[PDB]
């Protein structure tokens with residue numbers, strides 16, 4: 171079978187997809203989108219699942235979809251309608267945030283209340299440790315390339331450790347303009363480019379540390395750091411918790427201190443608070459979880475088709491794949507992994523998991539990247555932690571940036 | 580604490596309040612993402628409270644349609660009264676139209692309803708039961724046009740605004756998608772159609788439950804996993820895509836008549852059923868999905884329907900003591916149509932008129948329960964559902980034909 175469909179059945183769908191493709195007729199909406207994404211994701215998911223060299227553990231299926239889908243966009247295999255349809259689902263409909271919102275809610279409302287605050291105290295410093303590692307290693311390789319320290323921090327390290335595109339590139343160019351006075355484009359173009367390259371390496375290393383994790387069990391924790399109506403309620407909660415966090419980060423409490431708190435960061439606090447309040451009955455708490463499983467196990471391959479389209483512009487990467495950037499960026503990511511591994515080990519967490527959540531999930535392209543990374547190491551259950559790095563840890567990088575930027579001038 | 584437990588859409592009062600307060604915060608501060616998440620957040624919560632309210636009300640629940648009706652009317656009143664903000668209207672509309680949740684919803688419904696029907700029962704049903712249903716529609720048509728001409732009302736209106744909606748598969752299944760076909764063939768507003776259609780259809784549903792008890796007196800007097808569900812979602816979308824491709828590029832029109840893509844879908848999905856390409860496990864998966872929509876997300880959709888597809892003025896204008904007559908006689912035409920057709924096919928006239936007649940003019944599934952309870956024949960639920968579901972899919976095909984040639 172292909173995604174739970176007998177070969178004959180899948181062919182029916184596959185033929186349908188080709189008919190829509192060749193006649194160039196496809197609704198640019200949810201239905202048209204999911205139809206393509208389901209089918210396309212299905213075949214390449216299975217392929218990735220069975221390619222011997224290509225698939226290793228969890229990373230064999232999602233990574234395949236992701237990379238192949240981006241190659242379809244770059245190669246111009248997708249039609250403008252098809253790209254629009256997938257994009258309409260990812261961004262206009264904003265399936266990405268929904269997906270993450272459901273994950274966060276499902277992951278948090280599953281755990282004990284007492285265990286909650288035990289982590290968050292030790293996590294943030296581990297993230298700082300990863301940044302130090304990312305810095306130290308970056309400057310080390312940078313001097314090896316004859317590149318001044320300032321550039322390494324401004325154009326390499328800070329953007330990579332940034333909260334991704336919307337959260338880091340978009341605001342880090344703002345801070346750059348505010349401190350330097352120079353054009354935002356000059357910065358963002360270089361930043362967005364390099365950050366995407368590191369995001370690629372982050373997804374690669376996530377699978378590497380997964381193999382290493384199952385090979386050296388003492389480092390790994392194996393995915394641990396330290397009726398329909400119920401499922402329907404989980405979906406209400408996933409959206410409603412997102413709405414509240416949204417309202418807080420926009421109009422009530424956009425920033426606690428010098429740090430600006432992203433709405434996803436707030437959501438994590440909100441959902442965790444809702445858990446500790448015990449407002450949700452155990453049945454409903456499970457409903458959230460079962461819904462989160464439906465997304466993480468059924469719709470994950472669909473999301474990846476979208477991730478490969480919207481959030482991986484292969485053109486811009488190639489415009490900056492000078493050997494130099496490729497090496498520097500990659501080693502910065504390694505510095506993050508070793509930074510978070512050391513820091514987490516000292517804090518109490520498993521080195522493998524630490525390096526993934528506080529390391530790779532920091533160097534990745536924020537939320538889209540979190541999904542891409544966590545899916546490569548099958549530790550999708552850490553979405554809540556990955557988001558803390560991308561959102562709260564991302565907010566930290568801006569504060570650091572404003573400091574770093576001023577000193578360099 | 581006894582009352583703290585009372586549930587609103589499966590949520591204890593205290594929990595719902597959390598959400599209800601969140602909705603008001605988004606409303607007061609005027610901060611809401613105009614996307615899927617923002618939309619569903621509002622629609623879920625709003626639909627929840629008014630769904631229950633409509634559900635609890637005695638006379639309104641059983642004879643008007645209850646919660647789905649309460650939702651789509653109240654929601655339209657929010658738009659008219661200006662209670663919604665321009666953001667909130669945009670968010671809901673973005674879900675309904677730009678994201679096009681409507682079509683997905685319907686696509687899932689059609690697929691789940693058709694593929695749930697056993698392969699044998701479907702093709703068996705077609706030879707005898709299905710033609711009887713067609714005969715009931717003919718009867719419903721002929722009688723409707725007869726009364727319509729007696730009311731000085733053109734034949735177009737009688738078929739489009741009276742007969743077809745009544746014989747339709749109810750509200751979410753017939754009224755909602757018939758408005759789409761109407762817009763796709765005429766070009767006029769959906770809300771003009773739906774507001775009148777939904778109104779008359781509910782009235783006929785009332786007469787259908789009445790006549791069910793009449794024919795009863797007359798009768799006695801004159802003697803297994805999420806993956807399967809996921810596959811259902813693939814199929815629901817893919818079957819829609821194929822029907823889309825057909826109606827746009829391949830086979831836009833059989834003749835002078837234009838076949839709407841939803842019409843084609845029904846044929847496609849029914850063909851897919853008869854091919855038996857889908858294993859029974861997957862066929863159920865499609866059903867279990869259609870359930871999730873029909874029982875969880877139906878109330879959400881109605882919040883949308885009230886916003887875009889509801890003109891509360893036209894609904895008020897349609898409760899004229901003229902339409903009460905027209906609708907009622909259309910139902911009688913269905914009863915006599917199904918009685919004749921069934922008698923020729925081999926079935927009992929009383930039972931035929933109930934299953935292939937009244938169960939067609941009633942409000943889909945909710946109606947079947949209401950009708951088959953009035954006459955003690957609840958054991959015909961399996962037949963009643965064939966009319967409401969397969970017969971309801973037939974009505975869309977006929978509609979797509981009737982609409983085009985009439986325009």
Ligand SMILES: CCCCCCCCO[C@@H]1O[C@H](CO)[C@@H](O)[C@H](O)[C@H]1O
Pocket residue numbers: 277278280281286287289290393394395396438439442551552554555
């Ligand atoms: C304020 C909340 C911060 C902590 C959020 C993490 C809780 C949700 O995340 C959970 O963490 C657990 C403990 O590692 C893991 O067992 C689960 O895999 C994960 O779902």
Ligand code: NA
Pocket residue numbers: 329330331332333334338365532533534535536
């Ligand atoms: Na980053």
Ligand code: NA
Pocket residue numbers: 744745746747748749753938939940941942943
């Ligand atoms: Na009906």
